[PDB]
Amino acid sequence: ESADLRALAKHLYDSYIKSFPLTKAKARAILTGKTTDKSPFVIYDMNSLMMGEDKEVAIRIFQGCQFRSVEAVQEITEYAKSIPGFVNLDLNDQVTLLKYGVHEIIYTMLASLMNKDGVLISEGQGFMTREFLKSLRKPFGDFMEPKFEFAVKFNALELDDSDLAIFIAVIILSGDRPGLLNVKPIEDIQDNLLQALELQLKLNHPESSQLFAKLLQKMTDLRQIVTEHVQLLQVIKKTETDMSLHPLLQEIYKD
Amino acid sequence: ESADLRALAKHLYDSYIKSFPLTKAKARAILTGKTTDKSPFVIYDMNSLMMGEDKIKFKHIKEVAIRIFQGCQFRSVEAVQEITEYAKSIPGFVNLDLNDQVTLLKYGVHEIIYTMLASLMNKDGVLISEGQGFMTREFLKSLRKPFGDFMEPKFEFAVKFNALELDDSDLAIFIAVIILSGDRPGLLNVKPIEDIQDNLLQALELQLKLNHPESSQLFAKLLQKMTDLRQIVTEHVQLLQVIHPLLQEIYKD
Ligand SMILES: COc1ccc(C(=O)n2c(C)c(Cc3ccccc3O[C@@H](C)C(=O)O)c3cc(OC(F)(F)F)ccc32)cc1
Ligand SMILES: COc1ccc(C(=O)n2c(C)c(Cc3ccccc3O[C@@H](C)C(=O)O)c3cc(OC(F)(F)F)ccc32)cc1
């Protein structure tokens, strides 16, 4: 049964590597100056942003964020389908779980791209500083800061990709999403994923059941970040009428 | 090393029994009607509420919805003291920095209140006045504009949490784990807090393995419930923000 849980952990890690082209391993190699990977161009003000290439800045960056979130949804959906039992659930419930899980997973994976000083962009080819993002016209200057605050706390856990692979699967398989039809089979899958994560942490860390506990708490941080984020989106919708969310993102955010 | 985790589990149980008069065991017996004599007074509508006030010894008594909410506030202030007494019996707690003890309790009590409230609830209602009364879920659900959904999220949580079928033995260690959280804002010395919580978590794991040997997933499931509690609390304060100077002082939280 431990063996079943190890097999589940390995299946998930394999799918994660296959689904997500920029891993924490690669992000940390880029950020810490390892010779496996290359150095990013750093955008820290308006001039270096202009040089960054090769209708205002805040809006331009936001449309970029939108493009990469759309791709992330695609990657996460591919990953979700590999979680044993997911594709056998009622279709309505598959959609509900993805709708609520996608952004919580986005914030989780975004942390891998961040340190306290900024975030990797353009597949790790650029690095945009936290202070630059903060300087952006209101309320765009408020978007990324809560993500940074979360990322710094999440990254202190020092998880690697193999831990994250199971953690993300646990997120998607939440039986407490609004509007679910059959909660029991979702919870049955999550119970196994939770045990797989528990054992994975037990083998890989350091005070593992406490790490387990601290990691599970991050869900709450995640759902709070999402709530605060949609509120910001509502402001944007009202003040920037020449702008709207990509149809996929609109659908995710609808109710 | 298994023996000192059992010794710790036992100390916590004994202290939990001392601190909290109405145990889950006694509460479930009242809720199932296994208690052969003292059937609780049932509050299912406005008239039965008013009669309940006449018969039971209430200590908090203009509008029914306000009056019930005020009774809940009185009870919670009582519970904070019960929980505080319990916390001081957790090995290591009184040796923490004094500010940190205060900080752990400040953020910890509501999560514990919710956990313990679940012991008093079934899907149909909740025990009041140490089991002397029973207030139905539908009567609560029927209350005024903002007060009708005050208890619903507590019930929904309680129904799921009670499905784990924890007994007082399990809950004693579980509550100690919640209090000893190293991620509360403004903690000065997190290391010994997390050292104690690590020990409590190991004691909780063994306890669940011994008391529920047929459910290997229970520990994981319980830890996940710890996180639900923080969400419910956040949800509860956003409800409170929507909702006699000396009384304001007594009930500042
Ligand atoms: C889950 O997998 C992934 C998660 C994230 C990404 C990705 O790297 N990002 C992704 C998906 C984003 C966009 C983004 C991040 C967090 C929250 C929201 C968000 O986009 C908005 C439009 C949204 O989806 O509501 C992003 C932003 C970045 O910084 C910038 F400086 F540009 F603002 C940097 C990287 C970003 C790629 C894959
Ligand atoms: C931690 O130990 C205890 C935990 C709970 C109690 C307790 O039984 N209750 C306690 C503490 C309460 C009030 C209460 C419970 C959960 C969350 C909030 C709450 O009150 C509000 C006003 C608050 O504290 O902000 C309570 C309410 C009950 O239902 C009623 F019909 F009154 F609305 C019934 C029992 C209640 C006593 C001790």
Nearest CA in chain A to B202: A209
Q: Give residue ranges of A with CB < 8 Å to any B CB.
A: 1, 176, 191-192, 194-195, 197-198, 207, 209-210, 212-214, 216-217, 219-220, 223-224
> Taking a C-beta distance cutoff of 8 angstroms, is the pair B172, B15 a contact?
yes
Per the rule left: phi > 0, alpha: psi between -120 and 50, beta: everything else, B127 is beta
Looking at residue A40, the DSSP 8-state letter turns out to be P
Residue A84: CB atoms within 10 Å: 14
Query: Residue A50: phi, psi to the nearest 5?
Result: -55, -50
Task: Give the resolution to one decimal, in Å.
Answer: 2.2
Say yes or no: CB of residue B118 within 6 Å of ligand 2: no
Q: Is B201 exposed, middle or buried (0-12, 13-18, 19+ CB in 10 A)?
A: buried
Q: Whose CA is nearest to atom 11 of ligand 2?
A: B76
Instruction: Identify all chain A residues contacting B201, using CB atoms and an 8 Å cutoff.
Output: 209-210, 213
For strands B133-136 and B41-43, give the pairing.
parallel
- Rounded Cα–Cα distance for residues B200 and B2 (Å): 12
Buried b (16+ CB within 10 A) or exposed e, A143-163: bbebbbebbeebbeeebbbbb
CA–CA min distance A123, chain B (Å) = 33
- Cβ distance of A220 and B234 shorter than 8 Å: yes
Identify the residue whose tokens are 């970040």: A225
Residue B185's contacts (CB-CB under 8 Å, 6 or more residues apart) are B103, B107
> Taking a C-beta distance cutoff of 8 angstroms, is the pair A19, A78 a contact?
yes
Query: What does the block give as tokens for A146?
Result: 């809560």
- H/E element, A155: helix A145-155
Instruction: Identify all chain B residues contacting A186, using CB atoms and an 8 Å cutoff.
Output: none
B75 is in an annotated binding site: yes
- Cβ distance of B223 and A212 shorter than 8 Å: yes
Domains for chain A: give ranges and CATH numbers: 1-255 (1.10.565.10)
Closest listed residue to residue A101, CA positions, set A168, A52, A21: A168
Method by which this entry was solved: X-ray
* Interface probe with A: pick from B178, B194, B227, most Cβ of A within 10 Å: B227
- Cβ distance of A192 and B217 shorter than 8 Å: yes
Name the residue among B197, B227, B230 with its Cβ closest to that of A210.
B197
- Cβ distance of A195 and B223 shorter than 8 Å: no
B207 is in an annotated binding site: no
- Rounded Cα–Cα distance for residues A185 and A165 (Å): 21
Q: Is A254 exposed, middle or buried (0-12, 13-18, 19+ CB in 10 A)?
A: exposed
The identity of residue B183, as a single letter, is: D
Ligand 2 centroid–CA B126 distance in Å is 10
Residue A195: CB atoms within 10 Å: 22
Instruction: Identify all chain A residues contacting B205, using CB atoms and an 8 Å cutoff.
Output: 209
Buried b (16+ CB within 10 A) or exposed e, B22-57: bebebbbebbeeeeeeeebeebbeeebbeebeeeee
Closest listed residue to residue B146, CA positions, set B64, B242, B236, B62: B242
Query: Which atom of ligand 1 sits closest to the CA of residue A229?
Result: 25
What count of Cα atoms within 13 Å lies in the side-chain half-sphere of residue A16?
Answer: 21
Closest listed residue to residue A105, CA positions, set A123, A86, A79: A79
- Rounded Cα–Cα distance for residues B103 and B182 (Å): 10
Say yes or no: CB of residue B83 within 6 Å of ligand 2: yes
Mutate to test the pocket of ligand 2, among B75, B109, B144, B235 (most ligand atoms within 8 A of CB): B75
- Cβ distance of A191 and B221 shorter than 8 Å: yes
DSSP states of A50-91 as a string?
HHH----HHHHHHHHHHHHHHHHHHHHHHHHHHSTTGGGS-H
Listed by the residue before each break, gaps in chain B with C–N over 2.5 Å are 61, 243
Query: What does the block give as tokens for B232?
Result: 């419910």
Ligand nearest to the CA of A132: 1
> Taking a C-beta distance cutoff of 8 angstroms, is the pair B125, B41 a contact?
no
Name the residue among A195, A207, A217 with its Cβ closest to that of B220.
A195
Say yes or no: CB of residue A177 within 6 Å of ligand 1: no
- Rounded Cα–Cα distance for residues B236 and B230 (Å): 10
Cross-sheet strand order for the sheet of B41-43: B41-43, B133-136, B125-128, B121-122
A143 is in an annotated binding site: no
How many Å from the N-terminal Cα to the C-terminal Cα in chain A?
A: 40
The identity of residue A227, as a single letter, is: T
